[PDB]
Amino acid sequence: IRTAEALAALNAKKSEKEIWSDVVPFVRRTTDSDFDPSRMYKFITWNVAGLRGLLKKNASALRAFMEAEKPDVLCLQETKLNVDEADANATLGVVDGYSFVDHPCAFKRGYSGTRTYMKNSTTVKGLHARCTRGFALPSELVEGAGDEEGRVLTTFLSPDPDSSRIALVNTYVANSGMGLTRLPYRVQSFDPSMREYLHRLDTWATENAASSPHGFIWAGDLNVAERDYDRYYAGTFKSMQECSGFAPEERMSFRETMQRTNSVDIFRQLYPQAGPVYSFWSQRINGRPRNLGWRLDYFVVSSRLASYVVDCFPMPTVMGSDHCPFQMWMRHP
């Protein structure tokens, strides 16, 4: 089933001591008062693990959060909305000053699903934002039915269409499943399709228009913990690499994507050795209170946009999901 390279990395031992050696506690480089709304964009991403479930436990979850944070675009994943319920969907989680586009999973009910909010002032109008679903570029407001699992929702942003282009891809990457059962799917179908799309987006933003305020931001729950310290240590390193998200092929494929598309895990560019910082905590254990979890949520940015990023940090006090949101600020002229 598994290549020689993968097998080698699976057998090699690493103690907690020897991977958490160079790791330093996470201290956020900014305070909220550094945020300048006139020269910065705020993006956040959040796996809600059931949008209805979340809003049923607290009707104001999205109202209070948007109010407190005023993000320019908010990317949600695991909405678990059903595809035939357009009207029920379009009236669920509505918030003043915001438009949202839905991309619910068709191939399975109450599963997966993806949604993006755009602030009417800054994003809908100021950035002339248009969306697509699936692995599509725009026509020449939403477009196409997209991928059947609801995993990919893209928002295209420019201060002038037809200057600065950004493609923000809201992504809920396919989990390799409990037995690493769907690992061949993740590695052979999904990841390669994601790689191709990101390249094409980067060429949309770049070779078309033009270090430079052009490229893509790949945001969401990428279902991979890429640093050895991107998840708590338990058992053996071998046994750790048996969990979906930490399998050898998952990690190498993600690294490969960042490499092949010329992009960076922006959090690890700002805090290359920080830990423990997680965005996910398994409810199967009592994970959250004991802070043993995973960093599964990301902003991966085109290299040439890296320098514009002011900060990128988790928001672990925001409850309601087994994921916390992750926030990012980007400078613009």
Side-chain angles (χ1 to χ4, degrees):
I1 171 165
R2 311 186 83 169
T3 89
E5 173 153 65
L7 230 56
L10 230 187
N11 285 355
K13 262 293 268 300
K14 280 145 106 177
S15 160
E16 190 198 59
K17 156 216 145 216
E18 61 205 310
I19 43 192
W20 292 85
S21 320
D22 340 285
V23 173
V24 302
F26 169 73
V27 47
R28 190 185 144 188
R29 186 197 301 183
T30 61
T31 131
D32 281 343
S33 55
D34 308 304
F35 184 70
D36 177 349
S38 74
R39 271 144 292 174
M40 299 186 191
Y41 298 132
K42 182 188 295 179
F43 308 116
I44 131 154
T45 179
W46 192 17
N47 190 320
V48 295
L51 180 52
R52 284 173 305 243
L54 180 96
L55 286 173
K56 260 175 193 151
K57 266 279 166 288
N58 178 358
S60 305
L62 265 314
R63 283 188 270 279
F65 186 79
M66 298 297 256
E67 183 84 333
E69 217 64 56
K70 305 185 180 105
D72 300 304
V73 5
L74 164 69
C75 293
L76 298 181
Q77 52 280 330
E78 295 209 56
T79 58
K80 296 177 186 185
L81 302 189
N82 293 320
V83 71
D84 67 289
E85 296 173 340
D87 298 279
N89 296 337
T91 72
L92 174 70
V94 39
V95 175
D96 301 303
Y98 286 92
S99 293
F100 63 86
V101 173
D102 262 322
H103 176 37
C105 177
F107 112 113
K108 204 202 264 301
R109 310 186 66 72
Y111 186 73
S112 192
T114 224
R115 176 186 279 212
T116 306
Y117 287 86
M118 299 136 61
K119 175 148 86 206
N120 297 148
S121 46
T122 309
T123 308
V124 185
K125 338 219 321 166
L127 291 173
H128 309 288
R130 47 192 303 178
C131 308
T132 67
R133 306 184 185 95
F135 304 97
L137 291 176
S139 276
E140 286 72 47
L141 195 277
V142 61
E143 221 158 58
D147 63 303
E148 77 173 0
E149 308 200 36
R151 320 193 94 97
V152 174
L153 205 169
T154 303
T155 308
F156 303 74
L157 309 164
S158 200
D160 191 349
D162 213 28
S163 50
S164 155
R165 298 177 173 203
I166 305 301
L168 163 59
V169 212
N170 173 8
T171 269
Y172 176 50
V173 174
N175 208 114
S176 287
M178 201 89 309
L180 300 194
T181 327
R182 311 185 299 273
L183 190 274
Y185 181 76
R186 153 79 81 105
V187 170
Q188 301 180 341
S189 297
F190 184 90
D191 283 7
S193 180
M194 190 72 231
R195 232 188 292 297
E196 191 277 326
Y197 179 53
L198 288 175
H199 180 57
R200 185 149 41 89
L201 286 175
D202 194 35
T203 139
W204 168 81
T206 250
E207 82 95 28
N208 273 223
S211 291
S212 180
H214 301 94
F216 69 73
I217 303 170
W218 180 24
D221 174 354
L222 310 187
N223 270 319
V224 58
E226 94 81 27
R227 289 303 215 273
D228 294 333
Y229 40 107
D230 264 330
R231 60 146 293 183
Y232 71 98
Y233 193 104
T236 171
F237 201 60
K238 171 182 263 270
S239 90
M240 281 169 66
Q241 306 186 82
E242 280 156 21
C243 297
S244 72
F246 210 61
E249 295 88 350
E250 279 166 326
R251 307 212 283 160
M252 312 182 293
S253 177
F254 170 71
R255 304 207 179 101
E256 210 183 44
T257 281
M258 284 183 304
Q259 187 260 131
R260 261 181 103 345
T261 64
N262 194 202
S263 64
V264 291
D265 171 345
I266 196 69
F267 184 76
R268 291 315 191 179
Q269 250 228 19
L270 304 160
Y271 314 97
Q273 307 295 118
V277 255
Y278 309 133
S279 57
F280 163 78
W281 299 269
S282 181
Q283 277 189 117
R284 189 170 308 271
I285 55 171
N286 204 12
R288 203 147 192 169
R290 245 140 76 259
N291 192 249
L292 58 205
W294 305 52
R295 184 191 160 241
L296 288 182
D297 304 278
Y298 289 78
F299 285 98
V300 166
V301 189
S302 306
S303 255
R304 75 187 85 77
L305 287 165
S307 67
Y308 297 93
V309 179
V310 184
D311 207 355
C312 181
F313 49 97
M315 314 175 61
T317 64
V318 180
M319 305 293 184
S321 176
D322 53 11
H323 282 79
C324 82
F326 225 97
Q327 192 175 137
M328 161 207 163
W329 307 344
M330 186 173 86
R331 225 178 297 98
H332 65 85

